[PDB]
């Protein structure tokens, strides 16, 4: 198969907290409506978005079945592991005006947006006839765009939403994640030819365009701009209190990395890796280890081996994921 850019983020989403039970209790409603109309006329555009939830549920059931057998290469047993991503990708391509390899971040945002779309479509038939806040309260947060008139030192505040956090690598050499976060969220100064007109001062003054974090989701997705074969420091623990509106001690931890192999992004291969914690059911053997996904082959590797696979310049990481601790 040649659907690595989708399969990587699918494997990442599989281990996201609340995503599993969320899509389960969301597909429950679709099955209820199917059988209720079987006992008892919607738009086809919404119907296409409805169907991918059932497709995702079948996929996740199959992945759970494959996990119970501890089969790490089902290519010789079940072709379904490759046929299901195509079943999802056809519906995805149908749901979009956009476009054998493409962006792994674009497909992530697209899947999340389609799930939010069907969440709204099911909301519009719940109170008119928690559950539908899946994507909104897992990956999407509350960004704040306060700018400060350096003369009167007054703050003007605006609110926005965000799922991904696009971030550069180098400047225009080993940069910590703090520097790369600052490059995206820190201050751009308004001063010179085009100043900022302050209504309070009624005058041209200097300003500071800064970004801030107000209310954070359960999982932070981090996009990494590049191709550049120079990686950066990837810290395990993470806290956003330095760039937060209301400084709170909600820290996060790295649990999923999507890496890119090949210089040309036109036909580069995406590889996935996910850490496993809170395995309450039984498997403490895998607790702390890292699963690596390359094509249909999943492997178990220690934390230090994966951390050395990151650091030196073969496959550079493309997406990072941090869950709340």
């Amino acid at each position: 198969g040649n659907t690595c850019y989708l399969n990587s983020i699918l494997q990442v989403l599989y281990f996201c907290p609340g995503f599993k039970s969320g899509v389960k209790h969301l597909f429950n409603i679709i099955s209820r409506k199917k059988e209720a109309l079987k006992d008892e006329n919607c738009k086809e555009d919404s119907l296409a978005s409805y169907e991918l939830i059932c497709s995702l549920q079948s996929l996740i059931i199959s992945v759970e079945q494959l996990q119970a057998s501890f089969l790490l290469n089902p290519e010789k047993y079940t072709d379904e592991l490759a046929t299901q991503p195509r079943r999802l990708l056809n519906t995805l391509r149908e749901l979009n005006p956009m476009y054998l390899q493409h962006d792994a971040q674009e497909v992530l945002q697209c899947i999340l947006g389609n799930i939010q779309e069907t969440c709204q479509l099911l909301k519009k038939e719940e109170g008119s006839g928690i559950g539908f806040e899946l994507v909104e309260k897992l990956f999407q947060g509350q960004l704040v765009l306060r700018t400060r008139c350096l003369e009167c030192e007054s703050l003007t505040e605006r609110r926005e939403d965000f799922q991904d956090i696009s971030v550069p690598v180098q400047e225009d050499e080993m940069k910590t994640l703090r520097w790369a976060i600052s490059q995206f969220a820190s201050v751009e100064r308004i001063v010179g030819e085009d100043k900022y007109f302050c209504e309070n001062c009624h005058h041209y003054t200097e300003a500071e365009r800064s970004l801030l974090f107000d209310k954070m989701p359960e999982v932070i997705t981090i996009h990494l701009k590049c191709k550049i074969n120079t990686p950066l420091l990837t810290p395990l623990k993470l806290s956003l209190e330095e760039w937060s509106t209301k400084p709170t001690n909600d820290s996060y931890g790295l649990f999923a990395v999507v890496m890119h192999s090949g210089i040309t992004i036109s036909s580069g291969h995406y590889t996935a890796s996910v850490k496993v914690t809170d395995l309450n059911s039984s498997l403490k053997e895998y607790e702390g280890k890292w699963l690596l996904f390359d094509d249909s082959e999943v492997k178990v590797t220690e934390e230090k081996d994966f951390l050395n696979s990151l650091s030196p310049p073969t496959s550079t990481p493309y997406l990072l994921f941090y869950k709340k601790l």
Binding site: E153, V191, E193, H203
Partner: protein, 519 residues
């Protein structure tokens, strides 16, 4: 590059400040106070209790905000920094502008002074500090026209404060760089980069011999630094919001501070627990000036964002959080800033609203007020004067000073072509041509310029703007090129400076008398 023609709609003499005051200067020997109002007018008042209307004089040669002023030579000369990218030198005794250094690239924010050396320094948003001798500037005319800079460089961001010691041996600059940069004013060499604050610094101070430094930043932290040790020795936290003004006694013992939080404190540097809430003003404090009639200072003058300036006495001879003053001892009342404006559908008249909600009706063409309307509803009065005739936009209104400043840009100055009968100009023969409002106004502003007088007429032939109307030629962005009153166009020096300064798109209409044409 692009030149705009502005003019101020005002009375000939504005006794009171139509905007807030950014700096204060006191003359001890003559009992005179200099207020640098944001309305581009430096006002001299008398500080005597015997005065009931303490107005003395006005100095109105500035264009934009006036941020800092400095007295020199026993009160003979004054130097003012302004947001019009100019530093003006005036006679303090007779209140008239002597020179205008157009050296700064951006706003001029602060001035540092040394009275033992009679030495001044100007700093602003252009990341450059310029040193000047007072006696060199006082001996300047249109003939004696020679004075360049001795600039200090290094600031990686814009400057907001400046200070020098009394002896004039050490200078310090505070920037939005969050770092105090120290230079030697004699040798012009970088001394140290004090790295203590975490926000912009807006007030600095130094002792007599230049051994210790005081700093007031927008983080609420006052800081005392030892110069020889290159370190901050003390950090006081007496304000809730930013610290914007600083004063110190003669012995360099108590610091007088204020800022965004209107509370003003006299805190002992040797023990921060010994601080007294002097008073909480009505508006955030911009600057302060101590009375030095005794080693225990008797009173302090406070200039805030409001137009009025207060004088609070310092007489403790209570205990908890009581403000030392429930009301100021002296009050210099300022005017009211025109806060809102609206242009009618005919693009001929203007409806303005000041701080007291008093609405006024103006004729931007004639450049004069029509009537005062009182505390009427602004939107209801806007909809109450509804004329259906459409006229294009041919100008812009500006309130950077608090008063009406009408600006005309080359692109759309000559866009208005109105009917003479609809314009109110009744010809005896019942004629009605088409008149360009921009051209008529340009000819009215340059009515007293003989170069426009072509054989001979004088004016546009329909109306006359007031002769006191200040006409300005300024570059778009902040640069101010020339300023003069209308009737002052008859002066030979003003005439030559106009011949050099007036742009071509004004010359071809006011002098060449040609048609404006389109685009």
């Amino acid at each position: 590059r692009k030149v705009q023609v502005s003019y101020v709609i005002r009375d000939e003499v504005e006794k009171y400040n139509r905007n807030g005051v950014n700096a204060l200067q006191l003359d001890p020997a003559l009992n005179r106070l200099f207020t640098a109002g944001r309305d581009s007018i430096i006002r001299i008042w008398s500080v005597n209790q015997h005065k009931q209307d303490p107005y003395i004089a006005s100095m109105e040669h500035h264009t934009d905000w006036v941020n800092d002023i400095v007295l020199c030579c026993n009160g003979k000369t004054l130097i003012s920094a302004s947001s019009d990218t100019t530093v003006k030198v005036w006679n303090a005794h007779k209140g008239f502008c002597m020179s205008t250094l157009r050296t700064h690239k951006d706003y001029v924010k602060a001035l540092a002074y040394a009275k033992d050396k009679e030495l001044v320094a100007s700093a602003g948003l252009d990341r450059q500090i310029f040193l000047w001798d007072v006696n060199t500037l006082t001996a300047l005319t249109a003939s004696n026209n020679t004075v360049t800079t001795s600039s200090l460089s290094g600031n990686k961001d814009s400057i907001y404060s400046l200070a020098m010691n009394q002896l004039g041996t050490i200078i310090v600059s505070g920037s939005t760089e969050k770092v105090l940069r120290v230079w030697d004013p004699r040798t012009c060499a970088k001394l140290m980069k004090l790295k203590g604050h975490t926000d912009n610094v807006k007030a600095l101070l130094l002792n007599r011999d230049g051994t210790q430094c005081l700093s007031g930043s927008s983080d609420g932290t006052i800081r005392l630094w030892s110069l020889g040790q290159q370190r901050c020795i003390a950090t006081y936290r007496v304000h809730d919001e930013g610290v914007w003004a600083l004063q110190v006694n003669d012995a360099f013992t108590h610091v007088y501070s204020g800022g965004r939080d209107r509370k003003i404190y006299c805190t002992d540097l040797r023990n921060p627990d010994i601080r007294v809430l002097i008073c909480e003003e009505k508006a955030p404090v911009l600057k302060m000036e101590l009375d030095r009639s005794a080693d225990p200072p008797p009173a302090i003058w406070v200039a805030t964002t409001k137009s009025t300036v207060n004088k609070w006495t310092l007489k403790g001879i209570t205990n908890p959080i009581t403000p030392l003053c429930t009301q100021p001892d002296q009050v210099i009342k300022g005017g009211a800033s025109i806060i809102q404006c609206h242009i009618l559908n005919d693009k001929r008249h203007i409806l303005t609203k000041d701080t007291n909600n008093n609405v006024a009706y103006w004729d931007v063409l004639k450049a004069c007020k029509v009537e005062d309307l009182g505390k009427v509803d602004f939107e209801d009065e806007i909809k109450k004067r509804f004329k259906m005739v459409y006229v294009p936009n041919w100008f812009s209104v500006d309130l950077k000073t608090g008063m009406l400043t009408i600006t005309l840009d080359e692109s759309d100055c000559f866009a208005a072509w109105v009917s003479a009968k609809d314009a109110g100009f009744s010809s005896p023969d019942g004629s009605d041509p088409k008149l360009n409002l921009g051209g008529l106004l340009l000819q009215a502003l340059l009515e007293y310029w003989p170069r426009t007088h072509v054989n001979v007429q004088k004016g546009n032939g329909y109306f006359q703007v007031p002769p006191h109307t200040p006409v300005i030629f300024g570059e778009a962005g902040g640069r101010t090129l020339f300023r003069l009153l209308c009737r002052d166009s008859g002066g030979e020096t003003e005439s030559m400076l106009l011949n050099e300064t007036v742009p071509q798109w004004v010359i071809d209409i006011t002098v060449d008398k040609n048609m404006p044409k389109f685009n």
